[PDB]
C-alpha cells in the first residue's frame, strides 16, 4: 500500500498503553501475553531470529539498526563465557517518554521479550537498566518479574522449556549518556558512564567482558508478538525497510500532548492532527518540528506538510526518525532559544571523556547563548557550522553527533532569524 496510518486496535501491540487494564500477570494473560511461550522457545534460536529478520524490525532506541541482523551476532557457539542480554530502559532523550509507559503498564511484555530475545541470542540472564528517576516504574517492573518467577515463566526451567533465564533490574543514578549502549555496559559494571571505543563490539566483549546485546525496551517488548503473529504480519505495516508499528510521543505546542501507537510511515501532519489534536492555534501556526527527539534536526513547516514518519523519509528531509518523539513549536516560539536550551542539555550530559565533545559542545553552548541575545556577528554563523562539523564523526559516541545536528538544523532552516537578531542587537547599542 502507499497510504499508511489509521492503525486498528486489533493490530496494536501495546494494548494496555494507557493503563486502563490490570498491569499484573492476571491482566497480562488475559491480553495474550505469555501465550505459547514454551512453543516459541522450543522452535529454537534460528527460528526466532528468522522471524525478527523477516519482520524487518529496526532499532527503537534511536539508531534504527535492523534488529534481526544485530541479534544474530550472538548466534555463535559459546567460548566458556556467559552470554547476556541488556535491555536499555534509560530513556533519556528529551521528548521521549515511550519506554516509560511500557514498563509501568505492560511490564510482562518486556519480561517475555527478554526471555524470547535472550533465548534467541543464547543468553543466560537479562539485565534491564532503567534510569534512576523512574523509581515507581522500576518497582512495577520488579513486581512483574517476581510474579513471573512465581509462575515459573522465568528462572529455572522457564515456561517448562528446560532453559534457564534470569531477569535482573539495575537502576541508573542520573546520566543521559548511560543510554548509549557501551556507556550503559560500563555503568552496570560499576564505572562512570563513559562509552567504550569500538571494536570490540559488545557481541564479542560486552558487560563483564562477555558477549552482550544491548536492545531498546520497545525493540525487546514487541518481539514475542512478532513470533506469535509472525514476521509477515509485522512486515505488513509501513513502507518496505521501515515496517511495523511505532510508539509516538507528541509534546510541545499541541492541544493534546500524548503517547500513541501508530503505523510507520504515517504522515507527520496526520499524526499531529488525528491524535494530538492539532497544533496550538491551527496548522498555520506551526513553525518547526523536531521529529525524532532532541538529537534529530528540526524541520520547518514547509517540509512537515508532506513528510512521512519513517526512517528513510526523514533521512531525505535532512533529519531522522530517532526515538519518534515529536516536539512541536508554534510561531510564538523563540526558535533560537529553543535549540539553545537543547545545546545546554547536551553540555550538561557530555561524559567528558573525549576532546571534541568535552570542549566542543561546551563551546557551541556559549556561542548559542550569544546567538539568543544577538550578541554576535553573522560571520560567526559559519564559524559555528564548522565547529559542529568538527565534532561530528570525530567523537567516541553519538552524543557528540547528536549535539551537532540540532545546531545544523537551526542554521540550515533559520539563518535569517539569527541574522535578524544580530542586526537588532547591533542597532540597539550602536
Amino acid at each position: 500500500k502507499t497510504s499508511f496510518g489509521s492503525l486498528k486496535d486489533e493490530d496494536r501491540i501495546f494494548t494496555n498503553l494507557y493503563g486502563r487494564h490490570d498491569w499484573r500477570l492476571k491482566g497480562a494473560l488475559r491480553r495474550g501475553d505469555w501465550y505459547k511461550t514454551k512453543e516459541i522457545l522450543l522452535k529454537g534460536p534460528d527460528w526466532i531470529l528468522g522471524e525478527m529478520k523477516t519482520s524487518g524490525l529496526r532499532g527503537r532506541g534511536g539508531a534504527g539498526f535492523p534488529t534481526g541482523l544485530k541479534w544474530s551476532f550472538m548466534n555463535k557457539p559459546s567460548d566458556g563465557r556467559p552470554k547476556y542480554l541488556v535491555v536499555n530502559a534509560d530513556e533519556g532523550e528529551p521528548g521521549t517518554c515511550k519506554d516509560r509507559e511500557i514498563m509501568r503498564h505492560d511490564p510482562h511484555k518486556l519480561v517475555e521479550g527478554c526471555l524470547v530475545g535472550g533465548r534467541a541470542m543464547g543468553a543466560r540472564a537479562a539485565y534491564i537498566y532503567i534510569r534512576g528517576e523512574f523509581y515507581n516504574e522500576a518497582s512495577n517492573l520488579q513486581v512483574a518479574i517476581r510474579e513471573a518467577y512465581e509462575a515459573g515463566l522465568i528462572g529455572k526451567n522457564a515456561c517448562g522449556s528446560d532453559y534457564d533465564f534470569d531477569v535482573f533490574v539495575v537502576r541508573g543514578a542520573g546520566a543521559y549518556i548511560c543510554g548509549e549502549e557501551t556507556a550503559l555496559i560500563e555503568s552496570i559494571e560499576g564505572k562512570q558512564g563513559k562509552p567504550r571505543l569500538k571494536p570490540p563490539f559488545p557481541a564479542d566483549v560486552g558487560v563483564f567482558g562477555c558477549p552482550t546485546t544491548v536492545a531498546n525496551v520497545e525493540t525487546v517488548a514487541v518481539s514475542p508478538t512478532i513470533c506469535r503473529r509472525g514476521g509477515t504480519w509485522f512486515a505488513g505495516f509501513g513502507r518496505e525497510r521501515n515496517s511495523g508499528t511505532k510508539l509516538f510521543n507528541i509534546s510541545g505546542h499541541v492541544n493534546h500532548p500524548c503517547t500513541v501507537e501508530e503505523e510507520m510511515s504515517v504522515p507527520l501532519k496526520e499524526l499531529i492532527e488525528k491524535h494530538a489534536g492539532g497544533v496550538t492555534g491551527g496548522w498555520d501556526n506551526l513553525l518547526a518540528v523536531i521529529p525524532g527527539g532532541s538529537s534529530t534536526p528540526l524541520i520547518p513547516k514547509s517540509v512537515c506538510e508532506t513528510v512521512l514518519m519513517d526512517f528513510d523519509a526523514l533521512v531525505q528531509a535532512q533529519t531522522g526518525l530517532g526515538t519518534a518523539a515529536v516536539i512541536v513549536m508554534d510561531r510564538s516560539t523563540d526558535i533560537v532559544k529553543a535549540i539553545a536550551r537543547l545545546i545546554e542539555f547536551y553540555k550538561h550530559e557530555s561524559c567528558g571523556q573525549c576532546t571534541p565533545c568535552r570542549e566542543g559542545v561546551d563551546w557551541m553552548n556559549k556561542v548559542m547563548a550569544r546567538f539568543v541575545k544577538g550578541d554576535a556577528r553573522p560571520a560567526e554563523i559559519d564559524s559555528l557550522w564548522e565547529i559542529s562539523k568538527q565534532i561530528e564523526g570525530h567523537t567516541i559516541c553519538a552524543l557528540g553527533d547528536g549535539a551537532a545536528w540540532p545546531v545544523q538544523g537551526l542554521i540550515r532552516h533559520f539563518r535569517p532569524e539569527l541574522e535578524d537578531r544580530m542586526q537588532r542587537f547591533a542597532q540597539q547599542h550602536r
Binding site: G19, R20, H21, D22, W23, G27, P82, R104, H105, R124, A125, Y135, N136, A138, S139, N140, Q142, V143, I145, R146, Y149, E150, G155, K156, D164, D166, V169, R171, F208
Partner: protein, 44 residues
C-alpha cells in the same frame, strides 16, 4: 469486559523508599547460581 474507565496503576502510590531493594531481596531465592571469573576480583 473490563471497566477500562478508571486507572489501574495505583499501587505505586503506596511504594516507599525501600520498595525496590525489598523486592530484590525477595527475588534472591529464585535466582540461578552466578558464573565465576575464577578470581575473587581483578585485584584492585
Amino acid at each position: 469486559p473490563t471497566d477500562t474507565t478508571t486507572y489501574k496503576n495505583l499501587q505505586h502510590h503506596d511504594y516507599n523508599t525501600y520498595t525496590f531493594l525489598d523486592l530484590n531481596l525477595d527475588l534472591s531465592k529464585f535466582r540461578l547460581p552466578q558464573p565465576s571469573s575464577g578470581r575473587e576480583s581483578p585485584r584492585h
